[PDB]
Amino acid sequence: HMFSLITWNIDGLDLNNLSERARGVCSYLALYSPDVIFLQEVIPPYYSYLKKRSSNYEIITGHEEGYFTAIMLKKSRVKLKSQEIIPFPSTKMMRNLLCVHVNVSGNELCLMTSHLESTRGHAAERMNQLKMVLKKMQEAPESATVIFAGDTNLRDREVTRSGGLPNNIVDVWEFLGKPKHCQYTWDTQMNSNLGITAACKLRFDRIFFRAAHIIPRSLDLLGLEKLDCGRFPSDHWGLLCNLDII
Ligand SMILES: [Mg+2]
C-alpha cells in the first residue's frame, strides 16, 4: 500500500569518523525502513558495514573498486528481476548508471541511480550523462514504472541547457509544487562537513519519474542531526520520498 525510497550521498570519501557516520545512516535507514535505497559514493568498507547492518536488504553494487553507487531492495516486499550497469562514455571519474528492474506488489519498476560528474569534472560531461539517463529512462519497456534517484550534481540551469526534460519525465520535487523545506540537498551553510566558509545552497540529489499506478505522496530530508562527534552523517542531505501504490 505504501512505498518509500531514500536517496543519499553518504560521502564515503570523507574518512573522518566514518564508523559513527555509517552507524547513523544505518540507524536512519532502519528507522524509516524504506523499500528502495539509492546510495552514492560508497566505498568497500562502507559497503561491508551496510551489508553487515542491513540483512533484510539485497544490495546491488555499481562497481567494486574505488567508490560506486548501490541499490538496496527490501527483500520482504521488493522482488529483484534484472540488473544492468550502463557505463558512461567519456567519463573521467569512473561513474555509471545502475539500473535494476524489480517487481513490487503486482507492478513492474525500473529503479535507476547514478552519481554524475562532480564539481571538479566537466559540466558538459555531466549534461551528457544527464541526457543519457533521460534517454535510458524513455527507452525503458512501456510496461514498468521508471524511477531514477541520485546525486545529479547539477547547477547553473544545466537541465535547461541539456535540452530540458522530456514530456513523460518530471522531477518529483517540481511535481509537489517545489516545497521549500526540502529545497536544497547540499547546503554549506547548515552542513559543516567540508569547512566551506561560504554559503552555497544547491539541489544535487534529485528524483525523476515516469510511468506506463504509482503516485509521489511526500518528500522530506534526513540526516540533519549532528552525531556524537559533532559532524553530520554526510555533507549531502538524505532525500526521503513516500509514494502511494494505487
Ligand atoms: Mg564527496
Residue numbers in the entry: 112 to 323, 328 to 361
Sentences from the paper on this structure:
Tyrosyl-DNA phosphodiesterase 2 (TDP2) {also known as TRAF and TNF receptor-associated gene (TTRAP) or ETS1-associated protein II (EAPII) } is a 5′-tyrosyl DNA phosphodiesterase that can remove the covalently-attached abortive complexes generated by DNA topoisomerase II (TOP2) when it is unable to complete its normal catalytic cycle. Fortunately, this type of DNA lesion is efficiently repaired, in part though the action of TDP2, which hydrolyses the phosphotyrosyl bond in a magnesium cofactor-dependent reaction, leaving ligatable 5′-phosphate moieties. Consequently, TDP2 has attracted interest as a target for small molecule inhibitors that might have utility in overcoming innate or acquired resistance to TOP2 poisons. Using a ‘humanized’ mouse TDP2 expression construct, we have now determined X-ray crystal structures of the catalytic domain of TDP2 in complex with deazaflavin inhibitors, revealing the unusual molecular interactions underpinning their mode of action.
We obtained crystals of the catalytic domain of human TDP2 (hTDP2CAT–residues 113–362), in its unliganded form, using protein expressed in E. coli and purified using standard chromatographic procedures (see ‘Materials and Methods’). The expression construct contains a single-point mutant–C273S–which removes a potentially reactive surface cysteine, and that in our hands significantly improved the expression levels and solubility of the recombinant protein. However, crystals of hTDP2CAT typically diffracted both poorly and anisotropically. Through iterative screening of many crystals, we were eventually able to collect a dataset that could be truncated isotropically to a maximum resolution of 3.1 Å. The fold of the human protein is highly similar to that of mouse, worm, and zebrafish but with some important differences–see expanded description below.
